[PDB]
């Protein structure tokens, strides 16, 4: 798991890798780590998956309530305050490594959240197990106020370096673009690793297994 964030000249480009390992076995090849929060704000998670999912759904519910009660576009800092207040209230038992990003009336704002509750506004953040390779690529090749495709190439490059490090993903590294007007979300972005073809048809023929008791129940 390696999530990253960046701020280009207008907004935020987010990325993630979708290998949900359970211990030592690749248990998944496609797991949505980019979560919905609002039409302007998104979030990415790392560490314990279900804790991040339940917390991000709960805060998305509360921000939807606040936004529909208010009647206008939400703020990123309100999400930041809610998340840090909740995680400090749980006293760091809930392990949730979060990256928070959205574009407000002030513009783009990127936040990193550590599961004790320490939050930071930064131009680029990396979180997860193999986050260090993406921090390498970022600290190598970042400059302020980049363009769109430059930023996309940089983020894809960073998480691709994470996948060439250990515990990346088989995935087609997910990307997410938030601008002042245009929201985009790209699951099958770039597939580097094609699975090899089978070499033998190891197919079970109809009748190679003894059956002790069959049962048929029709339906409607």
């Amino acid at each position: 798991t390696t999530i990253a964030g960046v701020v280009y000249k207008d907004g935020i480009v987010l990325g993630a890798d979708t290998r949900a390992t359970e211990g030592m076995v690749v248990a998944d090849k496609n797991c949505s780590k980019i979560h919905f929060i609002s039409p302007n704000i998104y979030c990415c998670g790392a560490g314990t998956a279900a804790d991040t999912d339940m917390t991000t759904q709960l805060i998305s519910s509360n921000l939807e309530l606040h936004s529909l009660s208010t009647g206008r576009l939400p703020r990123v800092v309100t999400a930041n305050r809610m998340l840090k207040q909740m995680l400090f209230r749980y006293q760091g038992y809930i392990g949730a490594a979060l990256v928070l990003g959205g574009v407000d009336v002030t513009g783009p704002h990127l936040y990193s959240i550590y599961p004790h509750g320490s939050t930071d506004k930064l131009p680029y953040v990396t979180m997860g197990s193999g986050s260090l390779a993406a921090m390498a690529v970022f600290e190598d090749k970042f400059r302020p106020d980049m363009e769109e495709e430059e930023a996309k190439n940089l983020v894809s490059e960073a998480i691709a370096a994470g996948i060439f490090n250990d515990l990346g993903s088989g995935s087609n590294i997910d990307l997410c673009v938030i601008s002042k007007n245009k929201l985009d979300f790209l699951r099958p972005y770039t597939v580097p690793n094609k699975k090899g073809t089978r070499l033998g048809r190891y197919r079970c023929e109809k009748g190679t297994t003894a059956v002790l008791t069959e049962k048929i129940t029709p339906l409607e």
């Binding site: 921090m135 390498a136 600290e139 190598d140 370096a161 060439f164 490090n165």
Partner: protein, 215 residues
């Protein structure tokens, strides 16, 4: 040695066309205190191979003493044969395995680079006796941090020049200055060729901090 007192930090080394460059910094930190900010962490072995190490510096002094004794002994044989760097790697691996066999580990992480008989060589030695050959080695946090730059560029281009490799080592040491708490802005570069062994001086880096003007 059970508890490492004075550790070094990451060591970077990479082959190129007809030579290997190896560079590390000059810091003797104890706990969190940078106590010894002027040390040498690279041994210039006789004419071909070259050693850089991490971990406990007293063990590095001891191994430096022993290897100097062995090299001087074979040179005083007067037969015109020296040790290959792979033989240095083999001896050092057997020595470290014999240390950890007796439950007295030498807290080190050592990097052997040598160029002899047309071929370059770059060897790794763990504390545990885990040892291998590689096109690019990176120790401590370097395998977490500057190893992806190595494996990025070597896949994009398998061979390199001396200047390309030296440039990339300068960049990687700058990055290790950026985000390692066990780093220091003073490092030395050492490179081997067929022209011999040469250690360049205590260089430093060029930093950027323009992200601090953001909120």
């Amino acid at each position: 040695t059970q508890n490492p007192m004075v550790t070094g930090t990451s060591v970077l080394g990479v082959k190129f066309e007809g030579g290997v460059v190896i560079a590390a910094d000059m810091l003797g930190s104890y706990g969190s205190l940078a106590r010894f900010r002027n040390i040498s962490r690279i041994m210039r072995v006789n004419n071909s191979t070259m050693l850089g190490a991490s971990g406990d510096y007293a063990d590095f002094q001891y191994l430096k003493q022993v290897l100097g004794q062995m090299v001087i002994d074979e040179e005083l044989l007067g037969d015109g044969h020296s040790y290959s760097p792979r033989a240095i790697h083999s001896w050092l691996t057997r020595a470290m395995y014999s240390r950890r066999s007796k439950m007295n580990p030498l807290w080190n992480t050592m990097v052997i680079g040598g160029y002899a008989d047309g071929e370059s060589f770059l060897g790794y030695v763990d504390m545990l006796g885990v040892a291998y050959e590689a096109p690019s080695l990176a120790t401590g946090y370097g395998a977490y941090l500057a190893q992806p730059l190595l494996r990025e560029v070597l896949e994009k281009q398998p061979v390199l020049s001396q200047t390309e490799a030296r440039d990339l080592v300068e960049r990687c040491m700058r990055v290790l200055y950026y985000r390692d708490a066990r780093s220091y802005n003073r490092f030395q570069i050492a490179t081997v060729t067929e022209k011999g062994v040469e250690i360049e001086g205590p260089l430093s880096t060029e930093t950027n901090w323009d992200i601090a003007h953001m909120i």
